[PDB]
Design a protein around this ligand. Structure first.
Ligand code: TBA
Ligand code: K
Ligand code: K
Ligand code: K
Ligand code: K
Lengths: 98, 98, 98, 98
């Protein structure tokens, strides 16, 4: 159904994390004012970025790594909005009945 | 109806807060650079984390407590998206009439 | 229609801001580590809190003002989710036709 | 369809960024405690503000630039909520069939 598209986000996002998580630590690590130096840092970062929390304990300073960011942000933001869209039609699905 | 699923989130989330709120202060408190040392701190944290605000005045540094985080984040994020899904079908419910 | 409920949030939220904006600066201002000392500070705060951005340049440290927070957070979070619910049925409204 | 309204946000938001991105660096740059001094800074800012992450590495201190903020915030917040509304009716569109 549409939950095959919902779990599709999950699967697809955990990738974007590991993807940009690693993809990012590289484009960052080594440049001035670097913070995303370790892999597990850039790991926690993505989690905190993809959920739009951003305590600001870690972030990119590289005009390149900052792209990884924008991809990890929209990535997370969209995924959830799509699990919200699933619960939406699911609530309308049981009202299209009753 | 679907509002029994909406209030179901509320109930269910206040738990995840108290849960991870307390569950977290433990896995954190005592480790280097720990900030989530008090219970009422780790309490305010969860509120600020589950709503994705994250001013960054408090956060986990423990690869363990950071899990509590991810659970408290998705927890809040989902819950609201589900109250958004309720208002969604409710607005469609009164349009399925008129 | 349901846009009378959408604009209803707007109206209703600008209140919660001014409300908690002012209501908060009071419960905060004067206590140790206070930051929300000015009215226009506590003003900008609410905007930054109700949209879940929280750069963390301002926040409450008072177990009381922190309540104002939780009310200003959910306030903003809900309001938007309800403008999202309006665009949702509006897109379904034009598909219930075509 | 309603995806012509979805891509309409995208187009329309990238503007609000460049718009406020630039529009902001001006109203800010030069005032005390200014941080949004460079164009590419105020650029990264908007991305981080329109997605409600706000690590707090950059933000406005000018009662004017802070307006640019509120416009960039709602701008992003709304846009996504409208892509969420598209996925919402799209999931209901394939359930209105099956
Ligand atoms: C609630 C605010 N969000 C969280 C993800 C960002 C806009 C909602 C989407
Ligand atoms: K933040
Ligand atoms: K922050
Ligand atoms: K957020
Ligand atoms: K945030």
């Amino acid at each position: 159904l549409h939950w095959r598209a919902a779990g599709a986000a999950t699967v697809l996002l955990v990738i974007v994390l590991l993807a940009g998580s690693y993809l990012a630590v590289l484009a960052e690590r080594g440049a001035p004012g670097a913070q995303l130096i370790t892999y597990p840092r850039a790991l926690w970062w993505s989690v905190e970025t993809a959920t739009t929390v951003g305590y600001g304990d870690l972030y990119p300073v590289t005009l390149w790594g900052r792209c990884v960011a924008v991809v990890v942000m929209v990535a997370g933001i969209t995924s959830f909005g799509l699990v919200t869209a699933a619960l939406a039609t699911w609530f309308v699905g049981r009202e299209q009945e009753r």
